[PDB]
Amino acid sequence: GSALSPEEIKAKALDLLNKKLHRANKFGQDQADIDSLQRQINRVEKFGVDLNSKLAEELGLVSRKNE
């Protein structure tokens, strides 16, 4: 065990981002925010989630920003 397998993190990220992207578009959220989600999602499909990306922060894998 220990940690999450890339397949799970990638799918988990894609699922979370997909839901946001789908939810964002469904209500007409900020177009820029939706496209940003798309760029990150597509990046996950090709390379996956980055330990140092906004996605990883949203996923709760690492710290976003602290003083």
UniProtKB/Swiss-Prot annotation:
Keywords: Phosphoprotein. Facilitates RNA binding of SUB2 and likely plays a role in mRNA export. Suppressor of the transcriptional defect of HPR1 by overexpression. One of its GO terms (biological process) is protein-RNA complex assembly. This is Protein THO1. It comes from Saccharomyces cerevisiae (strain ATCC 204508 / S288c). GO terms for molecular function: chromatin binding; double-stranded DNA binding; RNA binding. It comes from the Eukaryota. Present with 6580 molecules/cell in log phase SD medium. Disulfide bonds: none annotated. Belongs to the SAP domain-containing ribonucleoprotein family. Interacts with SUB2 in the presence of RNA; this interaction facilitates RNA binding of SUB2. The keyword Phosphoprotein applies. The chain holds residues 119 to 183 of 218 of the full protein. One of its GO terms (cellular component) is nucleus.
